[PDB]
Amino acid sequence: NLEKFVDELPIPEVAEPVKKNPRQTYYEIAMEEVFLKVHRDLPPTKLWTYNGSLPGPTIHANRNEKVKVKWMNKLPLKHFLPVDHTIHGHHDEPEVKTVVHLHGGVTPASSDGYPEAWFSRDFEATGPFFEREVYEYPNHQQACTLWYHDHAMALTRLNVYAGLAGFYLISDAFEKSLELPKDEYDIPLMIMDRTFQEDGALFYPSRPNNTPEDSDLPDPSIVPFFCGETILVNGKVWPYLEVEPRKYRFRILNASNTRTYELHLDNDATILQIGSDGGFLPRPVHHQSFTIAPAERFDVIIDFSAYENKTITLKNKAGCGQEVNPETDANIMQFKVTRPLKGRAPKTPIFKPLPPLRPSRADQERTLTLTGTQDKYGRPILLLDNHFWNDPVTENPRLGSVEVWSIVNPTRGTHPIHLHLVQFRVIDRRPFDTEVYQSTGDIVYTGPNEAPPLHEQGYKDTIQAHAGEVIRIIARFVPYSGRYVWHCHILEHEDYDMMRPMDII
Template sequence: MVDRRRFLKTAGWAAAAGWIPSRLLAHDMHAMQAAPAGRVGNDLCMHAMGDVTRMPGLVDPAKLAPFVDTLPVPPVLVPAAGKPLRLRMAESTQRLHRDLPPTRLWTYGGAYPGPTIDARKGQATEVIWENALPVKHFLPVDHAICGAEADKPEVRAIVHLHGAQVPRADDGYPEDWYVPGKSRRHRYPNTQDAATLWYHDHAMGINRLNMYAGLTGLYLLRDEHELGLGLPAGDQELPLVLADRLLREDGSLYYPDSGDANAPWVPEVFGNLTLVNGAILPRADVQPRRYRLRVLNASNGRFYHLRFRDGRPFQAIGSDQGLLAAPVSMRSIFLAPGERADLVVDFAASRGGAIELMNDALPLMRFAVGQGAVRDDSRVPDVLRDVPRFTERDVSRSRELTLDEYSDCVATPMLMLLGGKRWHDPVTETVKLGTTEAWNLVNLTEDTHPIHLHLVRFQILDRRPYDVDEYMSSKTLRFTGPAQPPPAHERGWKDVVQAYPGMVTRIVATFDGYKGRYAWHCHLAEHEANEMMRPFEVV
């Protein structure tokens, strides 16, 4: 196999022959917004299939009436001391738009997204996750994928509470799956700071299918400090779970495949319909006052460039792992799969108006602002919390870790690796409990990869351009420009980082809390499956 970047350099003959479309699907908006000039990610082998969103029989978003459905708000579950929550994974149907037939989904608690678990710091939460799914999958399982071999049960599940600092047994390790008819009790200590967490399936080899089928929900962890800030709360706190999908005209989910029944996996999946809390182009009826929006990008592969149509500013008050040090005024924000944004928007000056939330030029939903006068006692303090920043002096060890993609476009359509290793290779990242490490993510690919570490929170130290060709020929890291510090909204605690192509992205984490084996991976679900995921071990 040739490495993917070198394949790109020699692929001109295929394009000239018409085998690869001349108009390639860029790796979503991140190609323009996030990646340095000239390093746009395109998956040539995948896109030889063409644009699946134009296939006959799929729902055309232009034919759906916008803003006719009310924004669904998932039910809230508040854990009671000493009493575990029970959440059932099962097949259900849900109407995603007024004009579409119901869609078959796999859900937690009977709806997509699943219930929002509202937990408190210092009060442990126990959840019994019951697997009542069918024994046969309704999406295309690829038995050539690691962990999804033909000798494995076709339907498996394990819940990962993304962003939680939990013991190894409760983390939702990809190989800890269990089959329909079984259940698993997880205990979440909730000892970390308030944050917007989320839960989703993590079963080895098929979690991309299980998540696409609907196995996703929010978990809001609160603490006394955050509750005392006076931020918008109650009905003025709205979860916004974003995820794109492809739908057939009969309402059923369409998950694209390669056309090879023995190897249906594709490197990336993009839908032409975006669900907001499980609804297409919904409308939220709001009052002319401040609202807090808990935004999650739960897509398999799509990045979102969020803004309001009228260009109004909003305040970012938190990222993946909780509050920022201070609010950041913004007019747009770019979220990769797995990332969260905690935003405050003020509708006070828009009484009687209609405000649309956009993904670049495409509307996602509308906020219909009421006419009546209301009292708003909420506020956004100038100081949110103390976020001490890591420096070079805090780091006891640095690791150089590559992000790799390989392809020959014949026998092996694509292989994604971290550090050049596959999932079952021996562990190479062994970390001593309590130590602080810098992980230097050397991106050798043409894509932006959202990298997620289980167990820990981290800070982005900087990103720096380097000579990719020289590194690939001699393993010499020669920087071609100065280090770029993260923008203000990325200077809080994170658990997903966008690693740009042509850049070395440095993150720093203290590996505290628990010993054991955890996972780190790309949060593009199709990349993670094949095999952009590795174990690390805290000892």
Template structure:
């Protein structure tokens, strides 16, 4: 096919010429060791993908060679087993930085898949040190099993799976290793939401291309950041100059004049989005990262930082013949081309009566109460420089390899206060749990850094689009963001990290050890305010020695 445009120049790329494609659905494989229809095999392999009808084919890495990977459909409390088979080449086609953790003395291509948002035993969590190479020839220090077991013991939710290999996550996800995992339950069945052809998962990612259509990823820091004495080198964040949805650059979707359900995910490395409709119509939010809201929530726009999800209903009734653009109003990285995402064209005839509904009540309200919390942890987000003079962002003033300082006890409730002293916001992802944002308080950053005094202003409640259960929490600049969570069901080795993938790969990631036995805690008294009004301000509790992590089992 003749290349009719320059893929590296967004001024030259026609928009809204490729139709949005719904991701394929994974099919179970028969295996005598697992119950019928519960076992899946997905191959991680190199393939060629067409991002735009006027582009040449592009080399990608994908689950089953697809972008996005096949959607896994699962049911609550019915276990799913997945074997992610690494069939990738031994050499990466994107620039590998050998100075990062494990990269200098490990095979160049390593993979491990994390089911993001899952309540799961740590051996199946996709720990970054559980990596493995093709044929499991080499494995990381925390590798335990070839088949991941997902018990699905949690409410219906929009989960997703993606590569999580130590020091390679930014490259492997950018190359294409991401897909949806939709967990359903009986509550969802009863809600009468749009379904089938009218339920569409949307993975939004920014990407840049070279003139020949290949993926562009920088081999080092770009201006205004100074050059560094390492090549290739990690950057502080890569921003693509085009927007893709389900692997298509600026696509369109033909819709009927009826209600549709869209499960939207920001799977970009660094870019955030503020999504709204060009006709100023409200979006009806029904869910966040961890599942359904208690009530449907009309909103004008929704912000999604990397790894955040939102579950929306858009009603195209009475809009026959109209074209509506999904806009991106993000102000951190504004741009003429990246300000638009895709088009909805209300051009299809209605195939029958729209009998779906928008329930006012969705899920029972099951909040966590601050006076039940056992521990508050003050966790600063800070900046420093590594040995090569590169900017490095840190959690709790520690690097990844430092011993775990966050050791929650099984069945404990904790409040984590993210104290963001850096000049940018961070999407903080905590493995294993779903939590809720209590709120944010502005603080005097200079006074905190220079004197160690945390002087805060009044509490600001969560934004209207982030009131539900979440596993990614925006830590705003100059704010203390407080999150409450319940550690339950599993013990073992987990992690928390910034989900800007370049930050995660460059030490903005820390271990978590969930332990069985109770340890000294700060008990919050019942007479403290139960409406999220108490200020943060307790240091980390003493760290106990965890149980042996090598022999942990669960039933």
């Protein structure tokens, strides 16, 4: 297989505004097919990317900066990965649909990137909910690390896997006061799992693993999950970073299709997390190890002072449908403390005052259940409340209303669930029978309410719902009314069809 820690970790370029003034900042980002070096031991890797880079241009925004972005489609008409077509109306309809969603963004539905607000090359053909070309981002939210990715109806797994993903960092006058590592020591890390062929081209399954004969199934077929052979950080496969012996701020973002990591430093140094999806934690938390699921973001600090002239590997203890291989997916990247101290370097902590969030005075309680469904061909259809995306809206919160959502997971798998617009807070988890639900259907709890860990007590937009467990989440639906979405961020699950509309007002 490919030799590890040979390619230098690329810092994704900051996006340059086409035009900028006090009133607003305008960007023009085009989606293109390009051929990029993933590893120096393979050939060119055809990828679909934002402005010719994987990850896409990192967009730097400030609280209440009117960031306008024209997301353009300059892709081939046909797709280079397997497109099943037995997922979604056979009145085809352009094959290559694209729409950009800013994950964790406080935006109006108009510029949120609705799955059915898609567009083909130069907007030649659009989706039913298409409205405008130039998306507006007012950024009325806390300092945090947001990421933009394709959300095209039933193509999200493929378009994201193809490389359509990038960083969107929001800075805040509060943030500047925290005396953290900045500039050269403030590095975004987009972790993705992938598989490549000998010819250096991408590989994405045409059928599920078992797949008896050609009996019943379509070709190509959607897979219930996808676990990659190799691990890429930002651009490159198992890369390295030359660091100074000092404190670094890494913005860790799991952008993988299904894979969930359990990251830890090879030296068992403490990984100090200062922030989650929504922004800074109530307090920084000493991790040692920690789990990171699709679309979760961990704003972290690691101190290399005292490991001067030493090699420290970023390791994973989380398998993917199989035991973690030490030679491959047990590794993420490698820090080498070789670069010298540019200047005198000491850096050292009170944090964000954590709002009271009283759930007793809520406006409504919802009980949402995760369930699996079968199809004609006899393969899993992952569903929310046993409801297909295309069915009538059930989740209809009022503009201003505060709701408590009880996510029940009877399934054997863990599911990271994500909600557009809002940043919710986790109340608690509670384990239930997972066996009488086989006979009856009524929930009964094995144990008492377990409050979330300190890193989950902050603002989250994507949360792990564990198996045989009910997790309660409170959210204040403010602001911007209109139609949004909530879904599971496992791409394979999201498409076909663990995704439902969410109507504010």
